Amino acid sequence: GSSGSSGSSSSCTVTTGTLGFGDKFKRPIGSWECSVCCVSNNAEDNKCVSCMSEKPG
Ligand SMILES: [Zn+2]
């Protein structure tokens, strides 16, 4: 137990140490899985449809 804040607030993120891709994400070869919304997109489509974000790469 540690004190020093307003109201007990449990966190999930690792303090004093941030990581990336904590888990795996099933994505197709051709198409590309968005990151902001993580919605299916069209390889040819240089943008998203759910968030309309520019395709990475
Ligand atoms: Zn998107």
Curated annotation (Swiss-Prot):
Chain positions of all zinc fingers (RanBP2-type): 28-57
Binding site for Zn(2+) 3: 34, 37, 48, 51
UniProt repeat feature Sequence, residue ranges: 21-22
Compartment(s) of residence: Nucleus; Nucleus membrane; Nucleus, Nuclear pore complex
PTM remark: Phosphorylated in interphase, hyperphosphorylated during mitosis. May play a role in the reversible disassembly of the nuclear pore complex during mitosis. Proteolytically degraded after poliovirus (PV) infection; degradation is partial and NCP- and TPR-binding domains withstand degradation.
Protein family per UniProt: Belongs to the NUP153 family.
Associated clinical condition: The variant p.Pro485Leu has been identified in a patient with spermatogenic failure. This patient also carried a homozygous loss-of-function variant affecting a splice site in the NUP210L gene, thought to be the cause of the disease. As NUP210L knockout male mice are fertile, it has been proposed that the increased phenotypic severity associated with NUP210L loss in the patient was due to the presence of the additional NUP153 variant. However, interspecies divergence in the nuclear pore function of NUP210L in round spermatids cannot be ruled out.
Domain description: Contains FG repeats. FG repeats are interaction sites for karyopherins (importins, exportins) and form probably an affinity gradient, guiding the transport proteins unidirectionally with their cargo through the NPC. FG repeat regions are highly flexible and lack ordered secondary structure. The overall conservation of FG repeats regarding exact sequence, spacing, and repeat unit length is limited. (Microbial infection) FG repeats mediates interaction with HIV-1 capsid protein p24 (CA).
Subunit structure: Part of the nuclear pore complex (NPC). Interacts with TPR (via coiled coil region); the interaction is direct and provides a link between the core structure and the TPR-containing nuclear basket of the nuclear pore complex (NPC). Interacts with HIKESHI. Interacts with SENP2. Interacts with XPO5. Interacts with RAN; the interaction occurs in a GTP- and GDP-independent manner. Interacts with MCM3AP isoform GANP; this interaction is required for GANP localization at the nuclear pore complex. Interacts with MAPK1.
The protein's role, per its UniProt record: Component of the nuclear pore complex (NPC), a complex required for the trafficking across the nuclear envelope. Functions as a scaffolding element in the nuclear phase of the NPC essential for normal nucleocytoplasmic transport of proteins and mRNAs. Involved in the quality control and retention of unspliced mRNAs in the nucleus; in association with TPR, regulates the nuclear export of unspliced mRNA species bearing constitutive transport element (CTE) in a NXF1- and KHDRBS1-independent manner. Mediates TPR anchoring to the nuclear membrane at NPC.
Protein known as: Nuclear pore complex protein Nup153
Shown residues within the full chain: 773 to 822 of 1475
